Amino acid sequence: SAWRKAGISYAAYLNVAAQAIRSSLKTELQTASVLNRSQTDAFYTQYKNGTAASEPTPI
């Protein structure tokens, strides 16, 4: 709805759309490429100008 103001970016909007589509899978047809395609395992760490550290959080 108001994801542009409050929620996601449009790439992330379609990402949540893909997570809902693959979340609405046939469990017979939900292959390992689907679950690995949703295997969100990237860790982001905000550094600073003094190369400080943030939390390596699960994106």
Binding site: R4, I8, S9, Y10, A11, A12, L14, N15, A18, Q19, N36, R37, S38, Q39, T40, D41, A42, F43, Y44, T45, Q46, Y47, K48, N49, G50, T51, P56, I59
Partner: protein, 214 residues
């Protein structure tokens, strides 16, 4: 120089060559797997980049630099070569802030320029990258970095020229401000009332990130 030293050493090196042979075979299997993802990302990206060939989005006139390696190493002159391309482009604009994707290029760049690095992405090189991951990181760039504010965006990836050769390669990203300013842009019919450049720029960022990673 005993028989014992030379014997144990030769047995160790035989074990080493056996392990490198198995590693080469596993590398061939993973490379054959990853070519599918590379082609399926490239053919998706070409459908949007042929548009940028037609809609000539060529910008004019602070800069964001994104480099792409993995967390692991053991691939030779890649982590240092791409860092040397970073050196080439960063000597031009030393004010250009850096967001690395890959632990090894982060250690390459943090020793030489810890100043410009402001976001680091980890947990990457285990698998072929997915659009879920790439779109998520592109969302994070317009959440903690706000790259639409940045005038010029460069993506640094590694182009396999062959299986036996390579290239560290640069890809420019044009912000959505440039997209309405494009000369070959009114040729394409676009709704003013749908934020199509301001979302297609995000879609461009996500696709170019996915293509650079894959």
């Amino acid at each position: 120089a005993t028989l014992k030293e030379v014997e144990m050493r030769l047995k160790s090196i035989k074990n080493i060559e056996k392990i490198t042979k198995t590693m080469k075979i596993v590398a061939s299997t993973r490379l054959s797997k990853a070519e599918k993802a590379k082609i399926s990302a490239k053919k998706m990206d070409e459908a949007e980049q042929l548009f940028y060939k037609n809609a000539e989005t060529k910008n004019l006139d602070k800069e964001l630099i994104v480099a792409i390696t993995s967390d692991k190493g053991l691939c030779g002159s890649i982590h240092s070569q791409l860092a040397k391309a970073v050196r080439r482009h960063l000597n031009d604009q030393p004010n250009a802030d850096i967001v690395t994707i890959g632990d090894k290029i982060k250690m390459q760049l943090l020793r030489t320029h810890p100043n410009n690095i402001k976001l680091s992405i980890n947990g990457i090189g285990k698998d072929a990258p997915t659009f879920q991951e790439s779109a998520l990181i592109a969302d994070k760039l317009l959440s903690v970095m706000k790259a639409g504010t940045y005038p010029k965006i460069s993506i640094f990836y590694n182009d396999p020229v062959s299986s036996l050769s390579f290239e560290p390669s640069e890809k420019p990203i044009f912000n959505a401000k440039t997209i309405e300013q494009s000369p070959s842009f009114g040729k394409f019919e676009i709704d003013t009332d749908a934020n199509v450049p301001r979302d297609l720029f995000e879609y461009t960022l996500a696709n170019q990130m996915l293509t650079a990673m894959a």
